[PDB]
């Protein structure tokens, strides 16, 4: 059974609703981004129209093998008509190809669905600037004031400086970066650039990256592990056992590993500043957890909502518990009161 918060009222549309079989009355299925919790249920045998970004469409065709006849890519920042309803896709500042969707209902109601997003002041000068939004379907992943983390720029600066220092001190050190989905590509691209290397990876991960429309990508990545001093591995392998095993396979080219695990928020954010972050170390292996978020912090979310001033908010994350739901509702009321709205 499809939950109410994935249905767009007054339309034949659903958002990120592929795991419920045939949804009654749904004439078009929207997909905000290529993360598995959102595409769950899509496969090569799907036979209904899917609306999405160009990048998401590349991944559907090449990774999930969805037939081309059912994939409907739309350009960003452009008014489009879908089954008689005006829609716009906006960049979500999440992972590559991730969008927010604006729906202009026949009755005059306007709905924004954020998908997954990291709110930014630049969104205040998108096509959102024009008009009023009645309903906001909101990515509430980190809707609580304890959720603080640095800018993506500060986190990248830390990674680049850490990697460049380590490898300049020891030219026989290998850098390893963990991954389990698209998103957070800047971490490994920025480290490789400072080291004057391509990023080496599996054939499957190389395929995925070739779908993302990243400029000059052929100059940045490779399947030839031997040529590269920055390697990607599955996130599950970023531990002392997994990294020891990998070092053995490199045939005496390297004698040290510096590894990075990009996480979201962790509790160590409530104690430590980014500049003060230290690794876990065992012998010749060191592992840094870095707080590289592709979701809004509490403060970024609050600013966005107080700027937009929607009439109604519908959370799409943390909706499973009464405690979570009551906590979010109390923050929404605070924000409204403080705004003078
Ligand atoms: N869920 C809601 O819609 C809501 C509930 C309780 C109190 C306020 C609310 N919505 C809101 C908050 C802040 C702003 Cl700026 C605009 C709308
Ligand atoms: Ni996501």
UniProtKB/Swiss-Prot annotation:
The keyword Phosphoprotein applies. Keywords: Cell cycle, Cell division, DNA damage, DNA repair, Hydrolase, Isopeptide bond, Metal-binding, Mitosis, Nucleus, Phosphoprotein, Ubl conjugation, Zinc, Zinc-finger. GO terms for molecular function: 5'-3' DNA exonuclease activity; beta-lactamase activity; damaged DNA binding; zinc ion binding. Changing residue 139 to N: Impaired nuclear focus formation, reduced interaction with PIAS and increased sensitivity to cisplatin. It is found in: Nucleus. Its main location: nucleus. Induction: During mitosis. The mRNA encoding this protein contains an internal ribosome entry site (IRES) in its 5'-UTR. This 5'-UTR generally suppresses translation while specifically promoting expression during mitosis, when cap-dependent translation may be impaired. GO terms for cellular component: fibrillar center; nucleoplasm. Expressed in brain, heart, kidney, liver, pancreas, placenta and skeletal muscle. One of its GO terms (biological process) is double-strand break repair via nonhomologous end joining. May be required for DNA interstrand cross-link repair. Also required for checkpoint mediated cell cycle arrest in early prophase in response to mitotic spindle poisons. Possesses beta-lactamase activity, catalyzing the hydrolysis of penicillin G and nitrocefin. Exhibits no activity towards other beta-lactam antibiotic classes including cephalosporins (cefotaxime) and carbapenems (imipenem). Belongs to the DNA repair metallo-beta-lactamase (DRMBL) family. Binds constitutively to TP53BP1. Binds CDC27, which is itself a component of the anaphase promoting complex (APC). Binds PIAS1. This is DNA cross-link repair 1A protein. It comes from Homo sapiens (Human). The lineage of its organism: Eukaryota, Metazoa, Chordata, Craniata, Vertebrata. The chain holds residues 700 to 1040 of 1040 of the full protein.
């Amino acid at each position: 059974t499809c939950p109410f918060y994935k249905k767009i009222p007054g339309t034949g549309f659903t958002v990120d609703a592929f795991q419920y079989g045939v949804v009654e009355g749904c004439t078009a299925y929207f997909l905000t981004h290529f993360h598995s919790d959102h595409y769950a249920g899509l496969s090569k045998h799907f036979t209904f129209p899917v609306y999405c970004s160009e990048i998401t469409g590349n991944l559907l065709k090449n990774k999930l093998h969805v037939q081309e006849q059912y994939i409907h890519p739309l350009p960003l920042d452009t008014e489009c008509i879908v089954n008689g309803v005006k829609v716009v896709l906006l960049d979500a500042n999440h992972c590559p190809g991730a969008v927010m969707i604006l729906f202009y209902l026949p009755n005059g109601t306007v709905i924004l669905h954020t998908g997954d997003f990291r709110a930014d002041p630049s969104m205040e000068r998108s096509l959102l600037a024009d008009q009023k939004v009645h309903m906001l379907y909101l990515d509430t992943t980190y809707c609580s004031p304890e959720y603080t983390f640095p800018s993506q720029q500060e986190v990248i600066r830390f990674a680049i400086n850490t990697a460049f220092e380590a490898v300049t001190l020891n030219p026989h050190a290998l850098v390893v970066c963990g991954t389990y989905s698209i998103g957070k590509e800047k971490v490994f691209l920025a480290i490789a650039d400072v080291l004057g290397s391509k990023v080496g990876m599996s054939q499957e991960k190389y395929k995925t990256l070739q779908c993302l429309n990243i400029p000059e990508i052929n100059s940045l990545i490779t399947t030839d592990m031997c040529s590269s001093l920055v390697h990607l591995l599955p996130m599950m392998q970023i531990n002392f056992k997994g990294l020891q095993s990998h070092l053995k396979k490199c045939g005496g080219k390297y004698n040290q590993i510096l590894a990075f695990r990009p996480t979201g928020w962790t509790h160590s954010n409530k104690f430590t500043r980014i500049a003060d972050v230290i690794p876990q170390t065992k012998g010749n292996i060191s592992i840094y957890g870095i707080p590289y978020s592709e979701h809004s912090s509490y403060l970024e979310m609050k600013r966005f909502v107080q700027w937009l001033k929607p009439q109604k908010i519908i959370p799409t994350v943390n909706v499973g518990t009464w405690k979570s739901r009551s906590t979010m509702e109390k923050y929404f009321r605070e924000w409204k009161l403080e705004a003078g709205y």
